[PDB]
Structure formats: C-alpha cells, structure tokens
Amino acid sequence: SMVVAVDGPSGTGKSSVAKELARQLGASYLDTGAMYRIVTLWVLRAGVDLTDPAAIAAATDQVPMSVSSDPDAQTALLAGEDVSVPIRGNEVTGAVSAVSAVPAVRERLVRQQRELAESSGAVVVEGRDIGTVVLPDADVKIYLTASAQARAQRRNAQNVLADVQRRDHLDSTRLRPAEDALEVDTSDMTQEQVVAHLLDLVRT
C-alpha cells in the first residue's frame, strides 16, 4: 500500500501541500514536525534545562501525546489538552531544535512515526528525514525545495533573507535528500501548482 514521504526545509508551504496531496490521493496525513513540537511544549512546561540532554530524555519518557492522521481533522493533544495553538508559538519554535537533537527523543518519535505509518494504509508522511531515516522504503519520496529568496518572501509576508540564509549554512554544517528522492523546486510555483506537480509524479 502507498507511502509518500515529503521532506524539505521550512518556508516552502510543505505542510499545506502535503495535506492537500493527501486529500487528493484519498490518503492519510502525518505531520511529524508537530510531534516534535508537542514534546517540546511538554519539556518547556516541566521547566527542564534545555542545555541538558539527559534531563530532556528523562523528562520525555512518557509524553501523553496524540495526533490525527486525517488531513481534515488535525489536532494536537497533550494530556487531553488541545495544544494546536501553543505548539505553533515562538516559545516552542525557539525550543524545538534543542529537544529534537536529543537522540532518546528521536528514537521514540521515529518509532511512533513508523507505527502510525504502517497502521494508516495509504499515507503521506511529512517532515525532514522521512525519506532518509524514518521511512526509507517509501514508495515515492519527494524533496520540496526553494531558493533562499523565495523562502524569505513567504516569511516576511507571513508577517529574514538574512535569517533564512543563515539557517541554511548552520543546517549544512550541523536537510539532505534521499538518493531516490524526487527534487522539486517550488520557487516559482503556487500551492495548487505544486500539488498538481506531485500528483503527476505520484501517478507515474
């Protein structure tokens, strides 16, 4: 059954495109970045020292987390609380890479990600290492990319080209596409154009 992995950096509209690709394939959708963000919110609220990986590992043994695989009903639950809003806040955005870098944390989420994928049948799974690490035997692997400039304009309008260009260098020396991935430059494209493009690639 069909597993589509969608990876790439931020600011390209990756998440919206993956959602809409899922709807069009009648498939399920899995937002992996949201899972990291949920754990991050959990860590922040316990007040764990973010400079201490062992403390982050210890504090994330039993994160009471739930996420939907329905692209039309995405909710982020933590301890029964709907945390869809706070997991997108700047606090979590600033903290998420501290928590994501802890191996113990990845180990669990990669496992949770694999299980959700196997039990979802037809599924589009979105993130950064889906095609390389999490689901290396995906049927189709897509790497959505865009120029620094394109990505910068999508952010400064959300409300930068310096900030976005900086993060590219630190990531390179710290995002790498799988060998069998299909690289798609979305710089010139709108969302619907990107969706149609991926539908074409998948249906080939």
Ligand X SMILES: Nc1ccn([C@@H]2O[C@H](COP(=O)(O)O)[C@@H](O)[C@H]2O)c(=O)n1
Site string for a second copy, 48-87 (x = CB under 8 A): xxxxx-xx--------------------------------
Q: Cα separation of 21 and 157, whole Å?
A: 24
Q: Please give the residues from 113 up to 132 whose contact with ligand X meets the rule CB under 6 A.
A: 127-130
Nearest to 1 by CA among 111, 90, 125, 105: 125
**Residue closer to ligand X, measured from CB, 45 or 106:** 106
> Among a second copy, ligand X, none, what binds residue 34 when CB lies within 5 to 8 Å by partner kind?
ligand X
Q: Cα separation of 85 and 13, whole Å?
A: 18
Residue 91 in contact with a second copy, rule: CB under 8 A: yes
Three-state SS annotation for 148-177? HHHHHHHHHCCCCHHHHHHHHHHHHCCCCC
Residue 3 in contact with ligand X, rule: CB under 6 A: no
**Residue closer to ligand X, measured from CB, 14 or 203:** 14
Q: Cα separation of 152 and 182, whole Å?
A: 23
Residue 101 in contact with a second copy, rule: CB under 8 A: yes
Instruction: Determine the size of the site formed for a second copy (CB under 8 A).
Output: 24
Question: 159 with 38: CB under 8 angstroms?
Answer: no
> Among a second copy, ligand X, none, what binds residue 129 when CB lies within 5 to 8 Å by partner kind?
ligand X
Residue 157 in contact with a second copy, rule: CB under 8 A: no
Shortest Cβ distance from residue 7 to a second copy (Å)?
Answer: 19
Q: What is the DSSP string of 45-67?
A: HHT--TT-HHHHHHHTTT--EEE
Shortest Cβ distance from residue 204 to ligand X (Å)?
Answer: 25
The single residue among 4, 20, 21, 37 that binds ligand X, judged by CB under 6 A, is 37
Distances (CA, A) of 30 to 34, 61, 173: 9, 22, 28
Site string for ligand X, 138-177 (x = CB under 6 A): ----------------------------------------
- β-partners of residue 123 are 3, 28
Residue 74 in contact with ligand X, rule: CB under 6 A: no
Question: 147 with 8: CB under 8 angstroms?
Answer: no
Token pair of 133 as six digits = 């690490």
* Site for a second copy, rule CB under 8 A: 43-52, 54-55, 89-91, 93-95, 97-98, 101, 166-167, 170
